[PDB]
Symmetry: C2
Subunit: 594 residues, 2 copies
């Protein structure tokens, strides 16, 4: 279990917080001489770099956009003098992909994983009342011992080029907000809630972790601040009579309030009373079935790359609502915590995905996810280091996101090898670990490439429901062969039906690249009309199987990828353009999903 | 030698001609029951179809655009009564890809090859003074015994889908003009001219073929109609003193006049006195070196497909002149005869290409032309039938085009297998046959894919000069690897240099797909800026080798291809858009080629 708290920062009497967002100093370190040359003390010749954002798309030259290797940030903040006697942490929403944090010259901690928060305890070096310095050494290379997976090519000048095993640009930097926070010396470290429904009434079971021994009181407030339940102890049950349940696209948020007393700490968070259970082939939310309708997405916008902005969230949610979606998948990595906060208010359902993408050794991975070629990926001697990373990223993800009502499943892989017992052994461990970290035991899943065929795949028995990525009519029998493609699709769904697994299937990826404004009569692959015809055919197949309980189309919006001959300025399978405007097919979803 | 004349039709006393262009009747024959059901007599339920044009892009539904198999045309013309006693032929500029011609109910002839004229002698069935009927059964399937090569997929309904081994849409139909012509019973069938330069003076050596025994007189007129030479005999030498030579981008056309006498026939054609010789690594035109600057092209325009229109020629030549080009390659098939006629007036140099494309078994042939995978193509038992077709298409091409001054080389293959003695044996025969059909023995060549490596290729010793297709910085080390690509290019050109072959090299294909209006700073593959950077780098490499004597960039204009995931509405490697407007890179050529 973890040496820090994953809880979002708040500001009350006992807990303080100050934003470090703004313009930082930035400098590339291509010869990797920073540590030995005093950069922990300040950067020798930096530039200005916005935070949060991704560094790549600001520059005007290739070597800098495509930089791969070591690079540094530095900034300076004044701590209020009133934060003596408090524990003081730096909280980075993310450090992509790995980094060591230095503060006032001292190395505080290093982290691996570029999509989950990083906590640095600077209590012993922070100078309250004075100006303080923070310096972060970051690395954005890809390998097969960390997620997401890939490789690093050295070119003739010795400069490094990222060669990912995934299909999305390797944005990196400090992409999410950065805080400095003050906690009490005895503090709430973690807590977990589970829900039971008793007719109209409800139980909120909870457990609490603290950095101390003092008694804990837990209060639960309704939307208007009035009290509805109170229990003493670090373990308890809250009784909410005539409970107001969090519903799909109709949220109700209670407020939990955790206290440590003699009052030493207070933590407050919005939660939603709802239950998630798989009965047979159905997904039950509050004991009634739900059908998932929505999109795979990316944290991706012009200029900012993966940088968080609230304006992107607002628009992306006003578009999801306009299509009448109810659900999205945080593909292929946990998002910024603000996305889940807002999903909670709006009643969207989230499949939360750990970044286990790239577990097949292929640099053009999307044509290759149906080629039939096994890459011997889980037979290699780096696999134990990889497994340790994957489990640690699952643990940090679940701890961070488990108390959001919108999060209803965990996706623990996208398009890996599953056709050999080497991969069963691997994934069995991962699921085992995820089952222990989630106090609610909500459904665990992953998304399968076409190569994980019903006859050969070893891993679908680990899944509570099964997610399929399928491109019938695009990478398989596309264009004039599109009727062959429908058959082949039905052929496979027939074989899955024949297995009588009695579990739900969700299509988590299907789509066509579509250039906005390419019209052709008759339609051709890449036009707007072909996208509509494609979707109308996948819909017919989905609607032919009682156990298909969900469609998450790929993608919500055009996004940026590694450049290559099959990628025309990124990936054009969006239903919206990258500036968040709808292609002709968005209307297809809107109508179907009403 | 051939049972018909390849000479363009003219109209004088002795030779008459009438156009059949207009709206014809058209009908698909998917069950292939036309012959047995009386369609030779008239079509049972036809539609209207323009001639010349390609049928595919008129329709609004897939099954008809993508039709593959048998299909029929029919029209009706009145012959003047005055054409009794004349021999009467139908002349189709083309019938793509194969066809049997019926006239007034009788089968006249069938043809194989879809890019060269088809002559049908209807003398014995034509009814002068009445209305006559012509009916053509056509087939547009692809195989490995005819050119260009491919395959035919049967889908689940039994309908056929063309699966070409080449990268261009399988347009088909009656794509060029169609005449009915009247000849004298004793007529000029063929003639050939060769040129010698004697200081300021010149010799036009000629031979003539007739369908008879009567004496032949040959006259040569200058631009203004005045006489400059006369010789009796079917074999002769014309002495032109103070000759006016056809020059690059500065043409002079004399007029040859062939007569049969007692006067029984007259044939007239414009020719240009010029010489083509390869001395060492130089291409000499009129004994001085020339550097080829221009484009590979296609017969390709919106709506019309491969249909000929003079307006396309005019605009395409006003664009070539604007880029300061001097040369193009009729890739990948002989064009309509009007293109060469106009090249003669404008002084452009032409590499004339027989349609020997597809001689490697691959349906995504352009990523595969550098993959390294041999397809065992010339070891197969269809190869002798294929060779017979290729030689017959070379023979018909050369006979048709040999007397154009603009035609200065023959390309006899594009991107075939060359790395085994199976293919040497094949191509040795082809060159042997082409050498016999060309009275001027002008240079013979072909274009090589990257897979025909210097160490392995068996076929470059047959070539008078060597043509290379290379995509360094696009299908090989493109994008951020573009400096690796330059090296690799130089590595190969170094190996060719080391072979000290002392022959000229012409790059006949290099380019990048470029979406008009995609700008990015820094540039990415597919943008307009990347095209410029690509070209500026290939130019540096070309300019580093004394023996590179030509650059023909691919392509002059965006054109239509089989639809697929790597083709965004056709092929975007044009320097012009398909509507004949310039991308940013066209200006690069303009400046370099002044
Ligand atoms: Cl640059
Ligand atoms: Cl249709």
């Amino acid at each position: 279990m973890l040496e820090y708290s994953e809880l979002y920062p708040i500001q009350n009497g006992h807990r303080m917080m100050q934003s470090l967002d703004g313009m930082w100093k930035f400098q590339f370190d291509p010869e990797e001489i920073g540590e030995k040359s005093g950069w922990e003390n300040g950067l020798p010749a930096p530039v200005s770099m916005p935070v949060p954002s991704s560094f790549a798309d600001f520059f005007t030259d290739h070597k800098e956009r495509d930089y791969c290797g070591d690079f540094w940030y530095e900034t300076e903040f004044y701590l209020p003098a009133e934060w003596r006697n408090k524990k003081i942490w730096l909280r980075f929403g993310s450090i992509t992909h790995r980094g060591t944090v230095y503060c006032n010259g001292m190395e505080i901690t290093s982290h691996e994983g570029g999509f989950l928060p990083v906590l640095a305890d600077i209590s012993t070096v922070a100078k309250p009342g004075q100006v303080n310095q923070v310096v972060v050494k970051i690395n954005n290379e890809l390998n097969e011992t960390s997620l997401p997976c890939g490789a690093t090519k050295i070119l003739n000048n010795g400069r490094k080029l990222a060669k990912p095993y995934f299909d999305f640009f390797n944005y990196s930097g400090l992409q999410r907000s950065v805080w400095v926070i003050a906690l009490p010396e005895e503090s709430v470290k973690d807590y977990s809630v589970d829900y039971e429904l008793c007719g109209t009434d409800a139980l909120v079971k909870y457990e609490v972790v603290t950095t101390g021994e003092h008694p804990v009181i837990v209060r639960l407030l309704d939307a208007e601040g009035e009290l509805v339940a109170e229990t003493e102890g670090k373990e308890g049950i809250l009784q909410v009579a005539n409970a107001h349940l969090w519903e799909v696209r109709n949220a109700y948020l209670y407020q939990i309030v955790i206290l440590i007393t003699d009052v030493l700490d207070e933590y407050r968070e919005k939660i939603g009373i709802r239950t998630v259970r798989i009965e047979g082939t159905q997904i039950l939310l509050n004991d009634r079935p739900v059908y998932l309708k929505g999109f795979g997405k990316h944290e991706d916008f012009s200029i900012l790359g993966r940088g968080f902005h609230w304006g992107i969230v607002k628009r992306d949610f006003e578009c999801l609502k306009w299509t009448n979606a109810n659900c999205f998948r945080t593909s292929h990595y946990p998002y910024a915590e603000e996305w889940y906060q807002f999903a909670d208010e709006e009643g969207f359902l989230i499949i939360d995905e750990v970044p286990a993408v790239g577990m097949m050794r292929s640099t053009r991975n999307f044509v290759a996810a149906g080629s039939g070629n096994y890459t011997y990926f889980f037979e290699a001697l780096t696999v134990p280091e990889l497994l340790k990373s994957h489990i640690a990223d699952t643990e940090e993800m679940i701890t961070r996101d488990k108390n959001h009502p919108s999060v209803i499943a965990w996706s623990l892989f996208n398009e890996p090898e599953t056709i050999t017992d080497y991969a069963y052994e691997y994934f069995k461990e991962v699921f085992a670990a995820a089952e222990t970290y989630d106090f609610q035991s909500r459904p665990m899943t992953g998304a399968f490439e076409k190569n994980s065929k019903p006859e050969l795949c070893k891993c679908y028995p680990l899944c509570d429901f099964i997610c399929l990525n399928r491109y019938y009519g695009w990478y398989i029998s596309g264009g004039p062969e599109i009727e062959e493609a429908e058959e082949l699709f039905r052929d496979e769904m027939d074989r899955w039906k024949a297995k009588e697994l009695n579990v739900p299937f969700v299509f988590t990826e299907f789509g066509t690249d579509t250039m906005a404004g390419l019209h052709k009569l008759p339609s051709i692959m890449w036009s707007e009309e072909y996208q509509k015809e494609y979707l109308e055919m996948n819909f017919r197949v989905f609607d032919s199987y009682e156990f298909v309980q969900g469609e998450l189309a790929w993608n919500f919006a055009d996004f940026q990828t590694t450049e290559g001959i099959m990628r025309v300025d990124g990936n054009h399978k969006g239903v919206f353009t990258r500036d968040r405007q709808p292609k002709a097919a968005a209307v297809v979803f809107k109508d179907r999903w009403e």
